[PDB]
Design a protein around this nucleic acid. Structure first.
Ligand SMILES: [Mg+2]
Lengths: 444, 237
RNA sequence: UCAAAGCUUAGAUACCCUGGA
DNA sequence: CTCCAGGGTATCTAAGCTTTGA
């Protein structure tokens, strides 16, 4: 009723780890083991550098992740050793298969990496090169290996040199390691979907998600992808693949909605009881007509526009300076909402995702960021009386899946981020045959 | 109490009434509205007509001002329509947004004359007439011969037929050349990224210097239509 | 591009309108 | 009935910075 606000306790958007362990800190992957795992067979391919670079690759990918003698910290747990000891994965790598790739002309990088890339022995192919080369070959490589089993994990010379600080040596490894155990086929964690109940309390924890994002460049041309997400506490099925503006034409939007419906149906075929559609731009008229045409009254839907560039700022309490707790939600319902007419804007929910947070002391200690929080605006359109608190909780948990940022310090929606990445990658794919269904791990 | 930077109305923005004038040149009509925003005429150019509200009770005075300003831009025009149009802000968000911003510009201009007496050339408030909305520039710096300024930007939104004005702290660069330097960016981050106490006090000062108490802001759009908006200060659920 | 955040810049897009072809 | 160029206001995507994650 009216405009109100609250703070969501951090221990309500928990994530699930091995043995069905619920906790609100993704880094507790070091204590509860990954929700899923696959044997990792690294192929560390290095590009022209210097002896220090190779020594640093050996230090990172062998001494830390393999050698149990090297007692690495691995926070939140007293266990020491490699990945096979801390997480419970079959990590495999030897410091003699690292390939000394060299290039001397344009396009040599991709061909050389393809020749040095192996399928049967290795499923993860780390690539080590200077920023000049990665910045301009990374998207091309990702597109080239799309669909295939060779998932690359790039690394820059600066990141390796950072390992000598002994401060970065204690923070860069773990986030990278999770990526490894996610790009070999594993699932570091999933998101507890019980919060979905607070959405409506008239549907089970299951549902459907879809975030349309736009990649600008495409040689001065707007493009986009779709992204999909679903959770049942046991399945994830995160598949993400696919225009004179930041909107989906009517035809393309109808095709996208039908394709998402068919995808979910191929999963379990229960005629999705709920369709949540994130988007990084306002609901265009074309998309509104498409939603009415395909969904109509058959499916309950919630179209959430996630406005990052917003002017709203939130301070308060006048005592802890003017810093604001991380999970703060300002809800404003809209009385002028959908008299069965076609005015679908239900409410507006301003959520702060970056602020004060209490992470475990590792021995809870209050922590803050540098600057002022930039909350997100959740412009919600719905065909039913959705609960703004449930929408905020769902969005928070959506920010958290993210097997690239194991922390609670980020705000972007993961589905939208990977949809934008897929849109950028679409540039350099010339075969739309197996594209219709690829995994996020390809463009993780 | 989780105070914010948003000033929201309390009731639904009552039905707006605007007077229209027929203009045959929209391009110069935009400059006309920009100019007349200072004299108390808050208008927007749509459908070949300048729709505006005013705070001037003298019809002859308003007619003379508009006629002069229109002649200065070589525009063939017509007579005032005296409640030409009725506008619900929700149905026409841009009409209300532009009229409201022009009224806010007028209020800020009026206050400038009295909130600049005890000020220096590096602290005099101004309105930047550039590609943006309302921008109160109030701090100047010449860092490494790069001219930069800290000010408060204003934006307006209409949600559920209620006005919401957001004032925030923004820094801008008016150097014609390219930065191409790292020290300048280091300094710009040093002074443009602050804890939420320099920002909160900056916002409080900005609002207080133009509306006395900063718990509320009153913006007059017409002799009888005033937007009386209050800062949220929401406690909890 | 190990990741993120909060800044500033450039351009572009959306909503309404105007002109021309 | 269809684009391109313009205007005002508000966002969005992409680049360059700094800091942060013990
Ligand atoms: Mg990657």
């Amino acid at each position: 009723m009216s405009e109100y606000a609250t703070i969501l306790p951090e221990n309500k958007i928990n994530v699930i780890f091995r043995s069905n362990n619920k906790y609100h800190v993704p880094e507790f992957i070091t204590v509860f083991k990954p929700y899923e795992g696959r044997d990792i067979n690294l192929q560390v391919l290095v590009v022209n550098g210097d002896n220090e670079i190779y020594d640093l690759t050996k230090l990172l990918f062998y001494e830390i992740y393999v050698k149990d003698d090297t007692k690495y910290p691995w926070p939140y747990t007293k266990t020491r050793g490699g990945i096979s000891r801390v997480f419970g994965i079959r990590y495999n790598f030897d410091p003699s298969t690292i390939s000394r790739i060299n290039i001397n002309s344009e396009n040599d990088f991709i061909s050389s990496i393809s020749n040095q890339l192996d399928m049967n022995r290795f499923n993860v192919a780390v690539i080590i090169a200077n920023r000049k080369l990665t910045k301009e070959f990374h998207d091309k490589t990702k597109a080239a290996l799309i669909g295939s089993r060779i998932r690359t994990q790039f690394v820059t010379f600066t990141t390796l040199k950072r390992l000598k600080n002994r401060k970065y040596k204690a923070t860069i490894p773990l986030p990278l390691a999770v990526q490894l155990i996610a790009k070999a086929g594993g699932t570091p964690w999933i998101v507890d979907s019980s919060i979905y109940n607070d959405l409506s309390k008239n549907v089970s924890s299951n549902g459907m998600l879809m975030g349309i994002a736009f990649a600008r460049t495409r040689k001065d041309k707007i493009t986009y992808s779709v992204g999909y997400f679903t959770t049942l506490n046991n399945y994830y099925q995160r598949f993400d693949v696919q225009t004179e503006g930041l909107y989906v034409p009517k035809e393309a939007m109808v095709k996208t909605l039908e394709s998402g419906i068919g995808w979910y149906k191929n999963i379990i075929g229960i005629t999705p009881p709920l369709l949540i559609i994130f988007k990084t731009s306002p609901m265009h008229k074309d998309e509104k007509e498409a939603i009415e045409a395909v969904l109509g009254k058959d499916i309950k839907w919630v179209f959430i526009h996630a406005q990052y560039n917003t002017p709203v700022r939130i301070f308060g309490n006048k005592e802890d300076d003017y810093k604001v707790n991380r999970g703060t939600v300002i809800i404003k319902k809209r009385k002028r909402w959908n008299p069965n007419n076609g005015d679908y804007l239900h409410s507006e929910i301003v959520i702060t995702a970056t602020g004060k947070y209490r992470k475990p002391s590792t021995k809870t200690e209050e922590r803050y960021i540098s600057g002022t929080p930039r909350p997100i605006t959740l412009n919600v359109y719905s065909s039913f009386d959705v609960n703004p608190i449930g929408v905020a909780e769902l969005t928070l948990s959506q920010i958290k899946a993210d097997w690239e940022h194991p922390d609670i310090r980020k705000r972007k929606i993961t589905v939208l981020k990977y949809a934008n990445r897929m849109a950028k990658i679409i540039q350099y794919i010339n075969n739309l045959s197996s594209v219709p269904s690829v995994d996020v791990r390809d463009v993780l | 109490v989780l105070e914010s930077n948003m000033f929201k109305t309390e009731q639904e923005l009552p039905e707006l009434i605007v007077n229209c004038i027929e203009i045959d040149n929209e391009k110069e009509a935009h400059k006309v509205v920009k100019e007349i925003s200072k004299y108390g005429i808050f208008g927007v150019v749509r459908e070949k007509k300048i729709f505006f509200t005013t705070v001037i009770e003298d019809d002859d005075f308003l007619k003379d001002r508009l006629t002069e300003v229109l002649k200065n831009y070589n525009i063939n025009f017509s007579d005032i329509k005296k409640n030409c149009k009725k506008i619900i802000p929700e149905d026409n968000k841009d009409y209300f947004s532009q009229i409201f911003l022009n009224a806010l510009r007028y209020v800020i201009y009026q206050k400038l004359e009295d909130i600049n007496k005890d000020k220096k050339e590096n602290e005099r408030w101004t309105i930047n007439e550039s590609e943006d909305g309302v921008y109160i520039c109030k701090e100047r710096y010449d860092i490494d011969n790069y001219k930069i300024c800290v000010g408060a930007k204003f934006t307006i939104k209409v949600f559920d037929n209620k006005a919401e004005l957001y004032v925030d702290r923004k820094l801008k660069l008016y150097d014609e050349d390219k930065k191409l330097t790292r020290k300048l960016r280091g300094k710009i981050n040093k002074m443009s990224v602050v804890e939420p106490k320099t920002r909160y006090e900056f916002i409080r000062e900005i609002i207080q210097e133009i509306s006395g108490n900063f718990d509320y802001i009153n913006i007059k759009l017409s002799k009888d239509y005033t937007v009386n908006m209050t800062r949220t200060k929401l406690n909890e659920k």
